[PDB]
Amino acid sequence: NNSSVVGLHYKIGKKIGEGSFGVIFEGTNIINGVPVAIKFEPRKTEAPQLRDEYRTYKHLQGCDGIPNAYYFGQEGLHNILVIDLLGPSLEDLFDWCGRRFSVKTVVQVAIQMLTLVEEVHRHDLIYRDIKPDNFLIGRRGATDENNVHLIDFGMAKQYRDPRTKQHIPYREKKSLSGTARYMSINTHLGREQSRRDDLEALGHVFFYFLRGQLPWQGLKAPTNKQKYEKIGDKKRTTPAVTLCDGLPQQFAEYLDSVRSLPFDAEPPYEEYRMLLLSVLDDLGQACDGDMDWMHLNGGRGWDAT
Numbered sequence: 001n002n003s004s005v006v007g008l009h010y011k012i013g014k015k016i017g018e019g020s021f022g023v024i025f026e027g028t029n030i031i032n033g034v035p036v037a038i039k040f041e042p043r044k045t046e047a048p049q050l051r052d053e054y055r056t057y058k059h060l061q062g063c064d065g066i067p068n069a070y071y072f073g074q075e076g077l078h079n080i081l082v083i084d085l086l087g088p089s090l091e092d093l094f095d096w097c098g099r100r101f102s103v104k105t106v107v108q109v110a111i112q113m114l115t116l117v118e119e120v121h122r123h124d125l126i127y128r129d130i131k132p133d134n135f136l137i138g139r140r141g142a143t144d145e146n147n148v149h150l151i152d153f154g155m156a157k158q159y160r161d162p163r164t165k166q167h168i169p170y171r172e173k174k175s176l177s178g179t180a181r182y183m184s185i186n187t188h189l190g191r192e193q194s195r196r197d198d199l200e201a202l203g204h205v206f207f208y209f210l211r212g213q214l215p216w217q218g219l220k221a222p223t224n225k226q227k228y229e230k231i232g233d234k235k236r237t238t239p240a241v242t243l244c245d246g247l248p249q250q251f252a253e254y255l256d257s258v259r260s261l262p263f264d265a266e267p268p269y270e271e272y273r274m275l276l277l278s279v280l281d282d283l284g285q286a287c288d289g290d291m292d293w294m295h296l297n298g299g300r301g302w303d304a305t
């Protein structure tokens with residue numbers, strides 16, 4: 001099968017994926033030359049997920065920051081999803097900036113993440129896998145080159161009925177699903193996740209960007225279940241003011257606020273964005289869209305990685 005073309009119009013190119021969440025490739029539409037990301041998944045697999053992820057992109061189609069889904073089908077023993085190709089993740093740019101983002105970069109990146117997560121909630125979905133690895137910027141020279149995007153909805157769940165807007169019932173004793181570094185306290189306790197838990201996870205990412213690390217990283221334990229327990233115990237023990245030591249206090253006020261939200265309550269997204277925006281007014285900075293990674297390699301941007 002020389003010159004492998006999947007989905008009729010998509011030329012398989014360069015591998016950029018992992019071995020756990022299906023291998024991901026670069027691609028080129030052979031009709032118009034637009035780049036795409038092509039994600040493979042074994043057909044007869046123990047965890048089928050790529051079909052519902054295709055329907056999540058179609059559900060969120062038209063949202064600023066959600067890539068377009070172009071094709072989904074079966075080819076051989078693989079399910080194939082084709083979406084827009086995007087740039088590095090905020091975790092990638094984090095590593096390239098010395099594993100520390102400036103206050104101005106964190107604020108501007110935060111208000112775009114709150115808008116993305118809000119748009120997800122608007123369509124009756126909760127993300128439940130908030131992490132900097134899944135927030136991607138655009139490609140070079142594009143109009144949305146430095147805008148934040150959201151991908152990978154394998155953990156997305158419907159939290160309310162699309163017709164009546166009846167919130168999902170609250171339950172407990174759930175299996176811990178997610179990355180323990182950012183998941184909310186309620187997720188450590190096995191509680192059903194809702195809109196408030198996507199925002200508390202964002203607050204953990206904000207302190208992660210500002211400090212360079214979280215005090216519950218590098219925690220050791222004999223098993224993984226007890227390691228998730230130690231991390232969750234440090235999160236309740238550490239007040240938001242302690243996390244915010246030396247930082248603008250609006251980030252601690254944000255984390256405490258989203259931790260106090262009722263289970264089924266609609267969070268004040270715009271009030272949170274205005275809260276993080278007042279940081280720039282307190283520091284005499286403008287929200288002009290200038291980011292730290294835009295100064296890499298001599299005011300040039302990232303390269304070769």
Ligand SMILES: Fc1ccc(-c2nn3cc(F)ccc3c2-c2ccncc2)cc1
Pocket residue numbers: 024037038039081082083084085086087089133134136151152
């Ligand atoms: F269909 C899909 C679904 C998800 C993905 C995807 N997962 N993912 C996970 C990361 F950690 C980083 C990046 C990344 C991508 C991605 C998307 C677009 N452009 C480049 C990379 C690609 C195709």
Ligand SMILES: [Cl-]
Pocket residue numbers: none
């Ligand atoms: Cl579930």
Ligand SMILES: [Cl-]
Pocket residue numbers: 181216217218219
């Ligand atoms: Cl960790």
Ligand SMILES: [Cl-]
Pocket residue numbers: 096296301302303304305
């Ligand atoms: Cl680089």
